[PDB]
């Protein structure tokens, strides 16, 4: 192989590994902003082209506006992603598998106060690169399991970033 061919071949491989890293970083930011309810920053993770259902939502603002109502202050959520499988499909598209464990806790001001939900899911994300930045375009999952229960009322929540 030529000098220029080998540099070209290396340059495309480094770009692919940068894309993989940026997508993993994007997903980390997504989960942090979702659970932190940092809605302004979470909006920046979502493709401008995002359309979601689920009555559909068009664009990052409508989607993030929905999350703001579906995930109020009174719900502590943890969406914990494990062992990704990222595939770069083209220079502007990618697919990513993430193994989720999810926990929901409903605090005393919730209509569902005392409730807990635990689950797991195999998520498949689609990403796209718009104007040189990777975004989440769509998401879907296969539910592994989900459980609903009333939390032991003797559990003391001593810290909560969403409280007053």
């Amino acid at each position: 192989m030529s000098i220029e061919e080998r540099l070209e071949a290396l340059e495309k491989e480094i770009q692919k590994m940068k894309d993989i890293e940026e997508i993993k970083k994007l997903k980390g930011q997504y989960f942090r902003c979702l659970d932190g309810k940092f809605w302004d920053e979470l909006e920046t993770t979502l493709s401008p082209n995002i359309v979601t259902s689920y009555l559909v939502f068009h664009g990052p603002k409508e989607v993030t506006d929905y999350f703001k109502k579906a995930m109020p202050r009174e719900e502590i959520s943890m969406h914990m992603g494990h062992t990704p499988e990222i595939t770069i499909d083209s220079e502007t598209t990618a697919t990513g598998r993430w193994y989720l464990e999810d926990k929901l806790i409903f605090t005393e001001e919730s209509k569902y106060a005392g409730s807990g939900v635990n689950g797991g899911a195999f998520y498949t994300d689609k990403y796209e690169k718009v104007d040189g930045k990777w975004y989440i375009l769509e998401t879907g999952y296969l539910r592994v399991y989900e459980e609903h229960f009333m939390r032991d009322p003797k559990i003391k929540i001593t810290m909560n970033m969403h409280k007053t």
Copy 2:
């Protein structure tokens, strides 16, 4: 350093980082297929040379056949890997540390219906590259802890991919 030496040095580094990525991806696939009970695909994660104990099992089919019996429909499992430490030992061999949290739930058709098991473990995997693809060759762990208990019978399992 020469032009060709620098290209050679870069080419081996990119290969190493591709191998690391492929091994992390392999492990993600492994856990997904194990917990999903997708046994045909899980078999593809295991080296053709795999021998396991545990009375030994030889080859991917015997090993995956054992998992099929040891992890029936009635057991929801989550094997959740965290913070890997991957070391590429040679061009065809690698070692990987994974911090596991494991959960087992026994559903109502199990002989052990109502039982839960939680634990943690420091796993060390060995991988090998056979005919240009990375596989899991062997695994072992140090148990951090394990706990056994009867689940609160008021917990409603509302979703379960293994059910009818």
Copy 3:
């Protein structure tokens, strides 16, 4: 762009991706040694320049000596890191976000026997590279939540690496 400029540009990118990988590996080692109470090896994760508060501790030994007393044999801990966001700030400095789930169990010899603590946190680490190796320089977190409770006394801990 020149041949030498393109090799130089590739060489700095590969170094950055090696640094990212080394830092993720460092963090894995950190959590494993912390939860394993492998204090000699955990000391090696900490920058020689580390100063901590928390009355301050100076250096890896003082810091690791504190952990040895604050995390006795009788406390099973799991510090489970998820979905990192690593940024290399310069050739010798970096920042890393890690989403933590933490669990603490107090075994029967603890003064707090039967107690459990669960939580989550958004950690931000600072790392530095001293004499060609990455270390943890400082850490801080935003607590997502924390809960305290008495464990169901019918839970049997069947395995525990910290026991006799």
